[PDB]
Every structure is written in structure tokens, then in C-alpha cells.
Design a protein around this ligand. Structure first.
Ligand SMILES: Nc1ncnc2c1ncn2[C@@H]1O[C@H](COP(=O)(O)OP(=O)(O)OP(=O)(O)O)[C@@H](O)[C@H]1O
Ligand SMILES: Nc1ncnc2c1ncn2[C@@H]1O[C@H](COP(=O)(O)OP(=O)(O)O)[C@@H](O)[C@H]1O
Ligand SMILES: Nc1ncnc2c1ncn2[C@@H]1O[C@H](COP(=O)(O)OP(=O)(O)O)[C@@H](O)[C@H]1O
Ligand SMILES: [Mg+2]
Ligand SMILES: [Zn+2]
Ligand SMILES: [Zn+2]
Ligand SMILES: [Zn+2]
Lengths: 338, 502, 592, 97
DNA sequence: AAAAAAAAA
């Protein structure tokens, strides 16, 4: 609210009120002349149509890891935005906001303490989104001449494989496989509705000290949809969404069975033999674009998982052996391997 | 103001109470069923009366039956007055002044929980569901008596409501009730009160949605009549309960979204809003799921059939033939089961030593020779019997177990099948794959008829007076005639001595 | 405003009596709806009107009423309902059924569907359309409409109307004979109430392209809209927008500067055939076509398809008193290497069957602690939910150990009991089981018998009705045929007709066996008994068990259940014995 | 004051116990011990409570038991030979015998 | 939210 209006029950003018504080109090009696008479004429009521409103949104901003002095924990800062600038920023980007730094009373908490201590917040005025733009490959002349240059370049896939990770030496087959993975296989169904998935599921086997993790980091960085996960370490990454018990009201917003950006994503995992039974069962649920249908409280908001699987792991002995090779494999069930 | 409609319905009520005059059978010319009921209350000192809705239905058609059913709360005191009038007309000494209660039964239809709507508030109704929780039988204030402290006058018969209400005036002319009153506990009259919870059955509920829950309040003689887990049918009147917290009280004062139907503008509420919630009031509950004492239950068939069975000469020859007619063959198993079902005498020594008075029977055979049929038949015939598998999925297993909430002060025990089978027959199937804990608890539960436990600060000695019947399969599948019982079975020697027949 | 009161009513009445959808037909460029619908209401007795905006938009005078409806919903709807109340009497010229009923409209398709991600404050008190998924419902909330007071001193009652929820309490009884101010007391249970219900709604997942989280918008319904939606339902609604202040502290009169938003709706939408049956039922080769219709893409595997269809048909159930109930369910197990597409058949049967739950390797009832509300609720499991249907189990080998015994309880008795938290009760399941299993290792070696490879208890396997084995072995011809068939797919099927036919067979048809088939059954039992011994006294394995007898009787009865017959014939018993002995003939180990 | 549950040997199987509150006046302090099954003879009385009325929405009253005699009944279930609060107490004549 | 003790698998 910016200006709050009350209807006066046909008693002439409708009394208005203006409040700028975060706490608001209503009226009880009005200054209408017949209402100002020695007996009341109708109880004043708040009218939603006549009053004026304004969009409100609040966020917080974190310090960058570069600017934090050693041995310290990054701090936060609330920010308020009103007007047409609403919805001009999204979580997970680097920005530089310009605005007014204003105090906010601590009396909202209502503890009768902090006689002079008060909270502070910033009011947004102008923002530069900064960072980078994916642009959804929007067609433009410059990139048209760029793809003309690529066409004139002739055979391209070997060059692209050479250009991914020059830091790691050789290993052309894995780079070619990654390039073929980045495009995707046959998709968009067949006749009668039989399911076919265009994502390719490739697993990398090797001993420690081969820089398969480095190549995985490179492909994750270069792919906008790449995500890296691992066995535990963080709990809100598998079999659960990121909105669990998040809101201040503890509204318990939840989708049920879902993964991290499982739709058209590139899941990358190191130590694919490490994770517990829960994440392994999650992968067994995601096999072949299968939807995630794990329910806990009557929810069935299944996430349409269609993702490529990138798995890097080693045999638990950490080295290859001259004996039968399936004895090493991945120390994982053969159904997943097939 | 004289509510003549209430007076008229009360007059009709007492009329068909006094002169219903229905006939039951040919020999029953005139019964006067309610007069006989009043005679029963005379000779047994009862307080509740039972009225069939169908017997009420044909009296004045819908001019009386519907008039009572729809506005039940409106006309309840008039019916109470009529009942008191007729009782004190026919039995004044019965009044020695007492809370008479009326329970209507046999309603035409029953409603589901999902069909409960606000337009039926104050109307007689019948509902059904699964009871999942009860509460302690707490006394309830019904008619309070008060003393005006500064003048010690007596004001009584103060009807109560959903809050504890004090009087508002003092009849003494010199006094003007400026001070409040002191409740006279020994002069007030209390009544029983118990709150139960019900939910929709698995039959009605569609899809994977959550069941709908309702709260039912009992009163009077219908306490402890709905045990948890039982599917029951309730008959009563729809009511609504507000939030007493917003209401004035001597004491100190999904959900976060609000948007409740709040009402404000009263004197006592001040600036507070009043909300409401649907609750059900019940008055009738039913469930759909010494030799001289026996001789006292006298009837023509009771005398004739029992005398014929006693005076016969080939009862035993016939008796074993009447056990489990479905199964084919196995005469000795039938005789053994009959002998188990009769049971043995239980005696105690002069110094407190107990002697076991039960028969334990085991059945061994190769697969598919109709061994589970006897178990199922004895479960379906013997009262207080329980069917159980040898391997139990629950932590209780066979005897008992202790469960406690994580950082919770429960420290309670859960009852195993042997505990539930008290004074009955326990029918365990597939005896072979029991585990060590049960395998060593059983031969204490069998011979000594008790179970003792001491874990995590709680100790108890539970009663396990049971008659066990078990089945098993020989090791290797088929009984090898070359070897003996010990060679084929994998049971321990002490367990075999426990059993009485094989 | 004071404009729509006078002329809009007359204009819309004129276009009510003069509308024809030929105008909409011409606009489309590929009849009196209102009067015929009102006459249908008159002959039906209901009170309900549907009203599309596009047809309302097709007329030039009405589009002004369209825009005024957008701006002022409540007044337009009220005057429209009053107009229809008058129109009933204007058209009938029994006047008795009209004075009891009211009239309401259900406008829809006013505008394009908008999402929770774009809701400006400029759209307050305007009509919008929403699509979403229902998350949770609430019990009916009584709403105050009429107060009932009583002068306790003189026992005099009066009825007081309310408005906007706020009630003006009378400070004195109207009876001047007593005229006391403080003698007025409210009666809670003698008033009149309305049934309000709050619905929680979430946005459809199609509005979130970049892995963000969905948002939830509260909903409100009245009267006929109560309980019209349940959990997981996909609906579209039409209603106005609203805002409301927050009380914050209930002790004071302070109000927050932010208003909660909620939507009040008036509209919801979701997202003699027996003659045709007997025409099909008279066809001679209906069995083969019906068996092959279930799995259109699966190549060969005819016998397993026949068995699955027959078990979908199901046997009979009887509960004679002196002997007890007999099982009517059929349970089948599938085994083979993970190269058979055996999960596709599971999905096929799951979606074809009327009732059924598809799970994996918890399945039964357990007491749960309710999440949003701090209460205790009893919840039933997957097996209980499949009463009368087919319960589908996948990955049966990794079944743990605690749950398996539960199955050992649910097949032999078909009644599961629970004793926890003071609750002792028994629940009915009466469900059919169809499961799939995988051998241990990369392949199923034919030399080893079945028991070792599957790793299942011998009794649990023994108590199944049937068992099917699939062995994919490398040959030129079969591999060529599969390659051709799969490539052709890569480059005669009925409809839900199947479902209603199955229902009719289940509940109208109760066939019985005749005396003639008894001789054949006894002969078959003897025949499989005679094979079980040979010219040596080695006491060969007893392969002819009574489980085989129940298998053939149930299968023969289920065959007679198919084709809508009433008494069995020989063909049923030969089919049953051949079907069982085909599986038995493939049950042999490396010896013999 | 102490909390009194139901003895597991007399509760119906599979059900839940019931709790009451017992008040011990002078000369009865520390007579009872935790975990020990007892039998108390006392007086039944009722008193008003505010929160209890608030939660149930009906005029319900709390109940307590003030003890007047306590008899320990742990282990020795044989209680027919003689009467009294204790069976291990002797009179002067029994000492003489 | 995080540490530490107990019964059952
Ligand atoms: N062929 C290579 N070219 C360049 N650097 C390499 C190569 N192989 C390994 N490295 C070095 O290995 C390091 C990263 O490899 P890393 O040990 O993470 O591989 P990994 O096989 O995934 O092992 P682990 O599971 O133990 O982490 C880097 O320091 C990188 O320089
Ligand atoms: N009257 C009867 N005579 C012989 N056998 C029967 C009779 N009725 C049922 N049966 C068979 O006996 C079996 C009983 O199960 P059970 O004896 O426990 O064998 P299993 O241990 O294999 O379940 C049933 O499967 C049924 O086929
Ligand atoms: N005869 C066949 N016709 C069509 N598809 C087949 C056939 N055999 C195998 N497949 C394919 O191979 C896969 C086999 O997987 P499956 O064995 O069902 O996995 P699971 O281990 O879950 O049983 C199927 O997804 C199917 O697409
Ligand atoms: Mg690594
Ligand atoms: Zn006014
Ligand atoms: Zn006084
Ligand atoms: Zn009055």
C-alpha cells in the first residue's frame, strides 16, 4: 500500500490516509459532517478499489569470495525494490546495484531491547545485470558470418575436440565422445508413442591420476546445462528439491521426487562408486528418461527427467589387474552397466 | 415467550411414549414396549432410554418424526420435560432429579465423512468410520451452584455453555452481586465426557488423497464404547464449536495463511475475531467390525439340546466327526484339536507354585498335505485366537518389544502375538525359521506362562497364558522314514519336551 | 458503477432471447442456445448456467457488457442472476419450484491463462483464468450468515442479519416491556451457516524453463464448488482477484503494510454399448486377437500374453459359510535376463487395468505422523489400494527381508492385520500379484536350476499360481527376425472398450464348472501323477500337487469368465492343462 | 507429587496406559520409588483448570488423588496369607514366638 | 541445529 482509502458509508467524502512506515493502523471515526454529528452514521470501511498500491519485492546479496579477507565468513545485506524495477534480477548472478542506504527500526521484532541499535537496508534505484548472456542462440548477422567461417573451416569436429581442454594432453577418443554427447542422439519419439531418449549415457573408467575429473570440470564449465554432484557431502542435492523448509513460514513447498535440473541437463559425477543406496536408486529411477515418482506426503509432482549421465569412477583396488576384467568393472550392479 | 411448537411436539412425544401399544408376536397381544422399558429402569436402576427411529417414523408421519429429527437441538429440552413428566407420572421413586438420556437408533441411512455439510447443523444424523484415538474419561460440569461471597446466598441450576459461566445477579434485595461467586463443588452435578477421533475408511477414499478427519464427543453411558481401530457407526446431532481462547476466560491466553471466517463486533470479544469448526455430538454407538450361571440362561432349546447331547451314548464318536468338515481325512489330528480346545484344569499349590493347565500340539508333514487348513479353521472358530507366521516383520516378533521415541519419554512396550493370545489359542505357522531371541523366549513363555523383561530402565512381568498350536516342515522337504523326529527336525531338544502331542 | 444497472440488463436479455451460435459459426468461417437450455433447466429442475465469453464476445452490444463485466464482476453477476430469476417466470408464461431455488452463472474463457510469475497489482479485482495442480484441500469452514440472539431474562429471540462479517450487536432487547440492556445472549448452534473451503494450487511445471521453483496461490470456493477437486488434480479455474490485510498481532489493531493475495473463483474445469460387446463376443478367434491386442510392439511371446490376459480376466470368488472363502486371485512371476523388455508388459498391464498400483523393491499400512498438521493418521499401503485389481511389482529379487514375510501373509490369507500405537484391526487386500525377477550374473545359465539363479525362498516361489521363463539365446534366425521387427517399428487395437468389457465380465458374469469337466480334471491329475513315478523304486519327485489342482480349476473358470459364457466346457480344461504343463515342461534342470 | 501409570500386568493387551497424579503429605515422603509397582488407598477429588478447559472447549475438570495409605506390591504377588500395609512386620507376641 | 547413549538388525 501507498495510499489507503476508506469508504464512509454514503457520508459525503471518503476519508483518505497515508502511511510510509512498515506498520499501519486503521481509523475508527471519520470527519464526515453528518458523521461528525452527535451520533454516528455508518462505520467506515477500507475500500480496495479506491486505494493505491505498489509492487514490493525484497532480496539479499552476498559478498564475493574474492573480497572476503582471510579467516572471515561472508556477510549479507537486504535490499528492497519497488516500482517498475521489480523482477529485474534473478538468483545466481553478479550485479552492481545503485541505491539509497536507509535505516529500519528494530521495533518490528518487539523485544523492548536494543535501545539505540537498529537494522539497515538498501533501496534499489538502478541495476546493471552484468555477468554474461546465453541469449538462447538468438539469430544475428555476426554469428551468421561466424558460422560461415566455420563452414569454410571444413572438417570441424577434430578441431573442436582439440579446443576443449588443451591442458590435458592427448585422449582424443574421449573428447570426440564428449563432442558427440553434446549434440544428442535420436529423440522426439517414434510411431505409436514408443519412448526413445536423445541423451547419451557414457561412463569413464580409469585409475586415479588421469585427469578425468579435470576433463569433467572442463566439460561442465563449457556446457551451460552441466551440473556436478557426488556422494553425500551435501544432502539437499539428491532425492529432494532445494525448496525444502525454506520459506520463513515453513510452508513446506515441495515437488516430491526430483533431481537437480534433471530436465535437459548434463549430470556429472566423480567417484561414481561412492554414493549410498539413495542416490544409486535415484539413478536407477532416472534410467532411460524415466520420470521420478517418489512420494512421501501424497505428492506426485513428478519431474520429467531427461538428462545425459556422466560418470567417472575407479575400481576399489585403484588399479587394473591381469585377471578377469569384469571382476573389477565398477563394483556396481551389471544392470546399471548395461 | 411460550414456544408452543416445542410444547406440541413434547405432547405428541409423551403420547406415543405412553400409548405406542405395538404387538410383536401372536402371543404378544399388547406389549407396551416403553412401559416395559420403564419397568426395567425400575428393577435395575437405569437412566438411559432407547427409541427406534422406525417406531417413531409412523407416528404422525413427517409432522412429528421430521419435526424432531431436523430441529433436534431446538426440541431436545421439550422431549426431556415430557419424559420426566411421564416417568414421574408412572414412577416417582425412579427420579431419586436424575439426568435422563435418550438414544435414537435405526436411522434410514448413514452418511460418509466427505458428505458432511454445514446445512445440517442441529439435525439428527448417522455417520461411520474408523476410530483412531480416544481420551480419558474426565468429569464435566453440567449444573453449577454458586455462593455470593459477601452475603452467602445460594444461586444454583446455572446452565453452562462452552465456557465456565458465573451468575449475573443475586436475588437478595440488599445485595447487588458486586462481588463474584464461589463454586460449590459438593452441590454441583458432573457428567462423563470423552472425545474420540474418526476418519474415512479405505473403501470410500479415492486415489492417493489423504483421509478426512472428524472429532466426536461422547457423553453419559456411551464412554469407552469405541476402542481404537474398530469400525463403528455413530448416531447423534451435528454441532459447531468456536475458539474459546478468544472468548473471555479467567486464564491467560496450513494455519499461518489465515483467511478463516472471522467474526468480530461483540462486547466480550473486544477487538478479537471468532472462528468456528465442525464437531459431532453422539448419543448411540454400535460396531460393525460357573455351570449354574450357564444354566441361568434358560430356554426350551437350551434345556432340550443340551440334555440330549449329555444323555447320548456315542457323543465322542460323533464329536470328532464334527470338527473341520471341510478337510479330508486326518481323524487323529481332529481328535487332538478337539482335546486341545477343551483344555485342562489349572491348579495352584498352597505356597504359590503354579501348575500348567494347557495342551500344546505340533503338526509336522510334507508340503501341501492340508496343514494350514486346521490353523485357519481353529482361528475362525476358537474365540480370542490369533493367526501368526513364524517370521514376524514387526519388532515385537512373538513375545514383546520395547519402543521409545527419539528423545521421547515413552519407554513403552508393544505386545506380541503371544501377548494378544491371552486366554486363547495362538496359531503360529512355519515354526522352523524362528530366530534365537524368540527361540529362547518361547520355552520360558510355554512352561512358566509368563514373560519377563528388563531393558533400558523399564522392567515388567507380562502374563502369557496361552494354548499354542504350531506347524512345521521337515528339513529336506519330505519326512525320511529311516530317521527319527530329532534327526529330521531342526528344533532343539528342550523345545520338544515343551510340546504335549505330535 | 451506476451505469450497468439499467440498459445492460435489457440488452443482455434481448440477446439471451435472440442469440444463435450461427454468428460464432460465421466468425469461425469453417441454434438458440439460451432458450433451449432454459427449457432443459425447467424440465430438469436444476439451477446452473454455463456461459462462454467468446459467444458473449461475438455480439456488438454485449462486448460493452463484456468489458463492464471485466471491471465490475460482483455487481454484473448479481444483476445477471436476478435477470435469470425473472427470465424463468417470463418464459413459463409452476411458480412453486422457482421460489425455492436460486440461480447462478459460471462464466469462463474470459481471457488467456496467466501464471503466478506475472501478476501485477494493476490486475486487482479483475477476472483472470488459471491452470494448475491441486496440492492440498481443507475441511469445510462454517461461515456466519444469520445471527440468533435470545433475551435470557424473558426468553425472547430475534434474528439479525450481518454484512462483511462484522455484526452489529443490539444493545437492548426489542421488547420494551422488559427492555433490559445486558439480557441479550448469542446462541451458537441455532444460527445459519455457509460452507467455505480453501484450496491450495500450484503452477503447472511448463512455466518454469530454467529449473526454478513453483509458486503456490490460495483459492476459495463456495457451495457447489466444495470438494470438486482432490489432491493431484489438474484443473483450470475462472475467478476474480483479491487482497486482504494481515492481522499480525492478534492482541492489537496494528496491520502490516503488505496484503496477502488470494483468488475467489466461480468456475472449474479439469485439464447401450453392451450391444457392441456381444458382437465381438461371438467371434471364434477372439482369444488370439484379444491376447495380441494388449502388447502391440512385443514380438512373439504369445503364451505369456495369453496368460497375462487370462489373469487380467480373473477367476471367481466365493465365501460359503461352512468352509470359508477361497482365493480367486491369480499370481504370475516373470524371470529372464534384462534384455526382454519385461518392464514394458508391467507398464502395459498397469495402465490397461482399472485399478492397480505399480511399485518396486512400505507397501502395506503404517501409522504416520501428519506433516502440515500435528496429528496422527492411519495410512493404507500399496497392496491394500489394489483391492480387486492387479498389483504390479518390479525388481522382485531385491525385496529386503522384512517385507517378504508380509507377502507370505497376504497371499495365503488375503487379510493383513496391524497392532501399533494401540490400534488393532484387520484390513482386506484381495489383490493379484504380477512380478518380474532377474537372475544373478550377466546371464541365466540353463544348466543351473531356477532356484539358485533367482535367489528367492522355495516356498514363496512354490505358492505362486504360475511361472514363466525367458531365455534369450543367440541364433541367426531369431536375431534376424527381432532386428527386422525393431527396425520396422523404429521407422486391430481396441480402446477403453477393453476396460469396460473387463468390468462387465468381472461383475455381471459368474460362471460355474459342470460335472463333465470333473472327469477330465481327475484324468489330468492322474496323468501328471503317473508321470511322477517310473519303472524304478527311487521314489521320484512328487510333481502333481493340489496347487496344480487349484491352478487348473481357477484357470478353467477364468477361461469361462472370458467370452461371457455361463458354464465351462472341455476346451477350457484342455487350455488350462496345456498352459500349466507348458511352463512345467520348461522347469527341468540339467538332468533329464 | 508423583505420576501413576497402569500396571502392564493388568492393562488390556495392545492398548495404552492411563496416567494420574498422586499427592503425598507428611510421613509419606520418599516411601515410593521410581519403577516400583504400588497400591495406594486415597481420596478422589477434582479441581478447576484453565488451559484444560481451553484445549477441550468444554467445562472439564482435572482430577488428582491424595494418598492415605501405600502398600508395595513388587514381586510378591502372593497376597492372601495375611492382611495389612506390610506383611514383613512383626508384633511383640510374634517376636516372643 | 548438534552431541551422546541404547536396542535391534
Ligand atoms: N594427461 C594429463 N595432462 C595434464 N594434466 C594431467 C594429466 N593427467 C593428469 N593430470 C593432472 O592430474 C590432476 C587432476 O587429475 P585427478 O587426480 O583429479 O584425476 P582423477 O583420475 O579423476 O583422480 P581422483 O579420483 O584421484 O581425483 C591435475 O593436476 C592435472 O594436471
Ligand atoms: N480337504 C483337503 N484335503 C487335502 N488337501 C487340501 C484340502 N483342502 C485344501 N487342501 C490343500 O492343502 C493346502 C494347505 O496348505 P499347507 O498344508 O500349509 O501346504 P503348504 O505348506 O504348501 O501351504 C492347500 O494348498 C490346499 O491346496
Ligand atoms: N523383444 C523386444 N522387443 C522390443 N524391445 C525390446 C525387446 N527386448 C528388449 N527390448 C528393449 O530392451 C530393454 C530391456 O529392458 P528390461 O529387461 O525390461 O529392463 P529390466 O531390467 O527393468 O527388466 C527394453 O527397454 C526394450 O526397449
Ligand atoms: Mg578424480
Ligand atoms: Zn458515515
Ligand atoms: Zn449476594
Ligand atoms: Zn427481553
Amino acid at each position: 500500500v501507498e495510499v489507503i482509502a476508506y469508504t464512509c458509508d454514503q457520508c459525503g467524502y471518503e476519508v483518505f490516509q497515508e502511511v510510509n512506515s512498515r506498520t499501519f493502523t486503521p481509523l475508527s471515526e471519520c470527519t464526515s459532517e453528518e458523521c461528525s454529528q452527535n451520533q454516528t452514521k455508518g462505520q467506515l470501511f477500507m475500500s480496495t478499489r479506491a486505494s493505491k498500491f505498489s509492487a514490493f519485492q525484497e532480496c539479499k546479496i552476498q559478498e564475493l569470495s574474492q573480497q572476503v579477507p582471510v579467516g572471515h565468513i561472508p556477510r549479507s545485506l537486504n535490499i528492497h525494490v519497488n516500482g517498475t524495477l521489480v523482477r529485474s534480477l534473478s538468483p545466481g548472478d553478479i550485479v552492481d546495484v545503485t541505491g539509497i542506504f536507509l535505516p529500519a527500526p528494530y521495533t518490528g521484532f518487539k523485544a523492548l531491547k536494543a535501545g539505540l541499535l537498529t537494522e539497515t537496508y538498501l533501496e534499489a534505484q538502478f541495476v546493471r545485470q552484468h555477468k554474461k548472456k546465453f541469449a538462447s542462440f538468438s539469430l544475428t548477422s555476426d554469428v551468421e558470418e561466424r558460422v560461415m567461417e566455420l563452414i569454410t573451416s571444413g572438417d570441424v569436429y577434430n578441431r573442436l575436440a582439440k579446443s576443449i581442454a588443451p591442458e590435458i594432453y592427448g585422449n582424443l577418443d574421449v573428447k570426440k565422445a564428449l563432442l558427440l554427447l553434446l549434440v544428442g542422439g535420436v529423440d522426439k519419439r517414434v510411431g505409436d508413442g514408443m519412448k526413445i531418449r536423445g541423451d547419451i549415457n557414457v561412463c569413464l573408467m580409469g585409475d586415479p591420476g588421469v585427469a578425468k575429473s579435470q576433463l569433467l570440470k572442463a566439460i561442465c564449465k563449457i556446457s551451460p546445462r552441466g551440473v556436478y554432484t557426488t556422494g553425500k557431502g551435501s544432502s539437499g542435492v539428491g532425492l529432494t528439491a532445494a525448496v525444502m523448509k525454506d520459506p520463513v513460514t515453513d510452508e513446506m513447498i515441495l515437488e516430491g521426487g526430483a533431481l537437480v535440473l534433471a530436465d535437459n541437463g548434463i549430470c556429472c559425477i566423480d567417484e561414481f562408486d561412492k554414493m549410498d543406496e539413495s542416490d544409486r536408486t535415484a539413478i536407477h529411477e532416472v534410467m532411460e528418461q524415466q520420470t521420478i515418482s517418489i512420494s512421501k506426503a501424497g505428492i506426485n509432482t513428478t519431474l520429467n527427467a531427461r538428462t545425459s549421465i556422466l560418470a567417472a569412477a575407479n575400481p576399489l583396488y585403484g588399479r587394473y589387474n591381469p585377471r578377469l576384467s569384469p571382476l573389477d568393472n565398477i563394483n556396481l550392479p551389471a544392470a546399471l552397466l548395461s | 415467550v411460550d414456544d408452543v411448537t416445542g410444547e406440541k411436539v413434547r405432547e405428541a412425544f409423551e403420547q406415543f411414549l405412553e400409548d405406542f401399544s405395538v404387538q410383536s408376536t401372536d402371543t404378544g397381544e399388547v406389549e407396551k414396549v416403553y412401559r416395559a422399558q420403564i419397568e426395567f429402569m425400575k428393577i435395575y436402576d437405569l437412566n438411559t432410554i432407547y427409541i427406534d427411529y422406525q417406531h417413531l417414523s409412523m407416528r404422525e408421519n413427517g409432522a412429528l418424526a421430521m419435526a424432531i429429527s431436523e430441529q433436534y437441538y431446538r426440541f431436545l429440552p421439550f422431549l426431556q420435560k415430557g419424559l420426566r413428566r411421564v416417568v414421574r407420572k408412572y414412577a416417582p421413586e425412579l427420579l431419586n432429579e436424575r439426568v435422563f438420556q435418550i438414544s435414537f437408533f435405526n436411522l434410514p441411512t448413514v452418511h460418509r465423512i466427505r458428505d458432511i455439510r454445514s446445512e445440517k447443523i442441529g439435525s439428527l444424523l448417522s455417520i461411520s468410520g474408523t476410530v483412531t484415538r480416544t481420551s480419558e474419561v474426565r468429569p464435566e460440569l453440567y449444573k453449577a451452584s454458586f455462593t455470593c461471597d459477601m452475603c452467602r446466598a445460594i444461586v444454583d441450576n446455572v446452565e453452562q455453555s462452552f465456557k465456565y459461566t458465573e451468575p449475573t445477579f443475586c436475588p437478595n434485595p440488599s445485595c447487588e452481586n458486586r462481588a463474584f461467586w464461589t463454586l460449590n463443588v459438593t452441590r454441583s452435578r458432573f457428567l462423563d465426557w470423552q472425545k474420540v477421533r474418526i476418519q474415512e475408511n479405505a473403501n470410500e477414499i479415492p486415489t492417493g488423497s489423504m483421509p478426512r478427519t472428524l472429532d466426536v464427543i461422547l457423553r453419559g453411558d456411551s464412554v469407552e464404547r469405541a476402542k481404537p481401530g474398530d469400525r463403528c457407526k455413530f448416531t447423534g446431532v451435528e454441532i459447531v464449536v468456536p475458539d474459546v481462547t478468544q472468548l473471555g476466560l479467567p486464564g491467560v491466553k496450513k494455519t499461518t495463511e489465515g483467511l478463516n471466517s472471522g467474526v468480530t463486533g461483540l462486547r466480550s470479544l473486544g477487538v478479537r475475531d471468532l472462528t468456528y469448526k465442525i464437531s459431532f455430538l453422539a448419543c448411540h454407538v454400535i460396531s460393525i467390525g460357573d455351570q449354574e450361571v450357564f444354566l441361568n440362561s434358560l430356554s426350551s432349546d437350551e434345556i432340550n439340546e443340551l440334555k440330549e447331547m449329555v444323555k447320548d451314548e456315542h457323543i465322542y464318536d460323533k464329536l470328532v466327526r464334527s470338527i473341520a468338515p471341510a478337510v479330508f481325512g486326518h481323524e487323529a489330528v481332529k481328535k487332538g484339536i478337539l482335546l486341545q480346545m477343551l483344555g485342562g484344569v489349572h491348579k495352584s499349590t498352597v505356597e504359590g507354585i503354579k501348575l500348567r493347565g494347557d495342551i500344546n500340539i505340533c503338526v509336522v508333514g510334507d508340503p501341501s498335505t492340508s496343514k494350514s487348513q486346521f490353523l485357519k479353521y481353529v482361528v475362525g472358530f476358537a474365540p480370542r485366537s490369533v493367526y501368526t507366521s513364524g517370521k514376524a516383520s514387526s519388532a515385537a516378533g512373538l513375545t514383546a518389544a520395547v519402543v521409545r521415541d527419539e528423545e521421547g519419554g515413552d519407554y513403552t512396550i508393544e505386545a506380541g502375538a503371544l501377548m494378544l493370545a491371552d486366554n486363547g489359542i495362538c496359531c503360529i505357522d512355519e515354526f522352523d525359521k524362528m530366530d534365537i531371541s524368540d527361540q529362547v523366549a518361547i520355552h520360558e513363555a510355554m512352561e512358566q506362562q509368563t514373560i519377563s523383561i528388563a531393558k533400558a530402565g523399564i522392567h515388567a512381568t507380562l502374563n502369557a497364558r496361552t494354548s499354542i498350536l504350531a506347524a512345521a516342515n521337515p528339513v529336506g522337504g519330505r519326512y525320511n522314514r529311516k530317521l527319527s523326529l530329532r534327526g529330521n527336525l531342526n528344533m532343539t531338544a528342550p523345545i520338544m519336551s515343551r510340546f504335549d502331542l505330535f | 458503477t451506476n451505469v450497468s444497472i439499467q440498459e445492460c440488463t435489457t440488452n443482455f436479455r434481448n440477446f439471451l432471447m435472440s442469440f444463435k451460435y450461427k454468428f460464432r459459426k460465421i466468425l469461425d468461417e469453417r441454434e438458440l442456445y439460451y432458450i433451449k437450455q432454459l427449457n432443459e433447466m425447467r424440465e430438469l429442475g436444476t439451477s446452473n448456467l454455463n456461459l462462454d465469453a467468446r459467444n458473449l464476445l461475438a455480439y456488438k452490444q454485449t462486448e460493452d457488457l463484456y468489458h463492464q463485466l471485466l471491471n465490475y464482476p460482483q455487481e454484473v453477476i448479481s444483476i445477471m442472476d436476478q435477470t435469470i430469476k425473472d427470465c424463468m417466470v417470463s418464459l413459463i408464461v409452476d411458480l412453486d419450484e422457482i421460489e425455492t431455488k436460486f440461480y447462478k452463472v459460471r462464466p469462463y474463457n474470459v481471457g488467456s491463462c496467466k501464471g503466478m510469475r506475472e501478476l501485477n497489482p494493476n490486475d486487482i479485482d479483475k477476472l483472470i483464468n488459471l491452470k494448475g495442480l491441486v496440492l492440498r484441500s481443507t475441511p469445510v469452514i462454517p461461515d456466519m450468515k444469520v445471527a440468533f440472539f435470545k433475551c435470557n431474562v424473558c426468553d425472547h429471540t430475534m434474528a439479525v442479519e450481518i454484512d462483511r462479517g462484522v455484526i452489529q450487536e443490539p444493545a437492548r432487547c426489542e421488547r420494551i416491556d422488559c427492555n433490559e440492556p445486558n439480557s441479550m445472549s448469542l446462541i451458537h448452534n441455532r444460527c445459519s451457516f455457509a460452507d467455505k473451503q480453501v484450496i491450495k494450487l500450484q503452477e503447472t511445471p511448463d512455466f518454469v524453463p530454467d529449473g526454478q521453483t513453483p509458486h503456490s496461490i490460495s483459492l476459495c470456493v463456495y457451495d457447489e464448488l466444495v470438494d470438486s477437486c482432490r489432491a493431484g488434480d489438474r484443473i483450470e479455474v475462472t475467478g476474480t482477484f483479491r487482497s486482504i490485510p494481515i492481522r499480525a498481532n492478534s492482541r492489537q489493531r496494528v496491520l502490516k503494510s503488505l496484503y496477502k493475495t488470494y483468488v475467489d473463483v466461480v468456475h472449474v474445469k479439469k485439464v447401450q454399448d453392451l450391444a457392441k460387446i456381444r458382437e465381438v463376443a461371438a467371434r471364434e478367434d477372439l482369444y488370439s486377437l484379444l491376447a495380441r491386442s494388449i502388447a502391440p510392439s512385443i514380438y512373439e511371446l504369445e503364451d505369456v500374453k495369453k496368460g497375462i490376459l487370462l489373469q487380467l480376466f480373473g477367476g471367481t470368488n466365493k465365501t460359503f459359510t461352512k468352509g470359508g472363502r477361497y482365493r480367486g486371485d491369480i499370481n504370475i512371476l516373470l524371470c529372464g535376463d534384462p534384455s526382454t523388455s519385461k518392464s514394458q508388459i508391467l507398464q502395459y498391464v498397469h495402465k490397461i487395468t482399472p485399478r492397480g498400483v505399480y511399485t518396486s523393491g512400505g507397501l502395506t499400512a503404517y501409522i504416520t505422523r501428519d506433516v502440515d498438521t500435528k496429528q496422527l493418521v492411519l495410512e493404507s499401503g500399496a497392496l491394500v489400494l489394489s483391492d480387486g485389481g492387479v498389483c504390479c511389482i518390479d525388481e522382485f529379487d531385491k525385496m529386503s527381508d522384512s517385507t517378504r514375510s508380509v507377502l507370505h501373509e497376504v497371499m495365503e490369507q488375503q487379510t493383513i492385520s496391524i497392532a501399533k500405537a494401540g490400534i488393532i484391526t484387520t484390513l482386506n487386500a484381495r489383490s493379484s500379484i504380477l512380478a518380474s525377477a532377474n537372475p544373478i550374473g550377466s546371464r541365466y545359465n540353463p544348466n543351473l536350476p531356477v532356484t539358485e539363479n533367482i535367489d528367492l525362498p522355495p516356498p514363496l516361489l512354490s505358492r505362486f499360481d504360475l511361472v514363466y521363463l525367458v531365455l534369450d539365446k543367440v541364433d541367426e534366425k531369431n536375431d534376424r527376425e527381432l532386428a527386422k521387427h525393431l527396425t520396422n517399428l523404429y521407422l486391430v487395437l481396441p480402446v477403453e472398450f477393453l476396460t469396460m468389457y473387463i468390468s462387465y465380465a468381472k461383475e455381471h458374469i459368474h460362471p460355474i464348472i459342470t460335472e463333465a469337466a470333473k472327469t477330465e480334471l481327475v484324468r489330468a491329475y492322474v496323468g501328471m501323477r503317473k508321470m511322477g513315478d517310473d519303472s524304478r523304486s527311487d521314489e521320484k519327485r512328487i510333481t502333481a500337487t493340489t496347487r496344480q489342482l487349484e491352478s487348473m480349476i481357477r484357470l478353467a473358470e477364468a477361461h469361462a469368465k472370458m467370452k461371457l459364457k455361463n458354464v465351462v466346457e472341455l476346451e477350457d480344461v484342455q487350455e488350462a492343462v496345456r498352459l500349466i504343463r507348458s511352463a512345467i515342461k520348461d522347469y527341468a534342470t540339467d538332468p533329464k | 507429587r508423583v505420576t501413576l501409570q497402569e500396571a502392564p500386568g493388568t492393562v488390556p493387551p495392545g492398548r495404552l496406559p492411563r496416567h494420574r497424579e498422586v499427592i503425598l503429605l507428611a510421613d509419606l515422603v520418599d516411601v515410593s520409588k521410581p519403577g516400583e509397582e504400588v497400591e495406594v488407598t486415597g481420596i478422589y477429588k477434582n479441581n478447576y483448570d484453565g488451559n484444560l478447559n481451553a484445549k477441550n472447549g468444554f467445562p472439564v475438570f482435572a482430577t488428582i488423588i491424595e494418598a492415605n495409605s501405600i502398600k508395595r506390591r513388587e514381586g510378591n504377588t502372593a497376597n492372601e496369607g495375611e492382611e495389612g500395609l506390610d506383611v514383613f512386620s512383626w508384633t511383640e507376641e510374634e517376636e516372643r514366638e
